[PDB]
Write a protein that binds this ligand. Structure first.
Ligand code: NAG
Lengths: 90, 94
């Protein structure tokens, strides 16, 4: 299925499955290799089988919603803080 | 790294409320008042006092009569400065 770049996608590569944000990446694999991995034994970076390229995997961002409010006494108005995102996914 | 790996599974690192630049403003203040105002800024409004006349008190605190500092000031200056220098290498080299 056509590959998705810079957009949250479920995926399967060569049977490897996960969900992340696939990007272009400059880390450099030796020929025979398949995965990359991080310190945590997550699957960090994968290589596209059909067109060899080094694709990062960053699972889609998430964070705690924080409702900032004065006392409900003074107002009903809230200002929401989405923690640790770029402002798009709103 | 530990930068996002943890952040994969729901292990989040929240930002400390006070940025490091702010911490460095406090430790500037505390250090700015200590130098100029003596110890009085902790008890109320800071009181400008000549630093060399501050150290006359801090000797009275330890029982050395202030006439030692007013006479040894130049010497005590160098011992202080040369002591500060080695603090760099104490950190720098180990
Ligand atoms: C986050 O999104 C804003 C636009 O809402 C943009 O100006 C900013 O550069 C982005 N920052 C990052 C981390 O990409």
């Amino acid at each position: 299925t056509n590959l998705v770049k810079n957009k949250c996608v479920n995926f399967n590569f060569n049977g490897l499955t996960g969900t992340g944000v696939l990007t272009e990446s400059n880390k450099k694999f030796l020929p025979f290799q398949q995965f990359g991995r991080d310190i945590a034994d997550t699957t960090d970076a994968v290589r596209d089988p059909q067109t060899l390229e080094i694709l990062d995997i960053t699972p889609c961002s998430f964070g705690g919603v924080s409702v900032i409010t004065p006392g409900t006494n003074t107002s009903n108005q809230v200002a929401v803080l989405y923690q640790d995102v770029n402002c798009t996914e709103v | 790294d530990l930068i996002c790996a943890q952040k994969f599974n729901g292990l989040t690192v929240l930002p400390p409320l006070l940025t490091d630049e702010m911490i460095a403003q406090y430790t500037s203040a505390l250090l700015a008042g200590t130098i100029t105002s003596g110890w009085t800024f902790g008890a109320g409004a800071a009181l400008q006092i000549p630093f060399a006349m501050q150290m006359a008190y801090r000797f009275n605190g330890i029982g050395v009569t202030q006439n030692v500092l007013y006479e040894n000031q130049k010497l005590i200056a160098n011992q202080f400065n040369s002591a500060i220098g080695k603090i760099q290498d104490s950190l720098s080299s180990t």
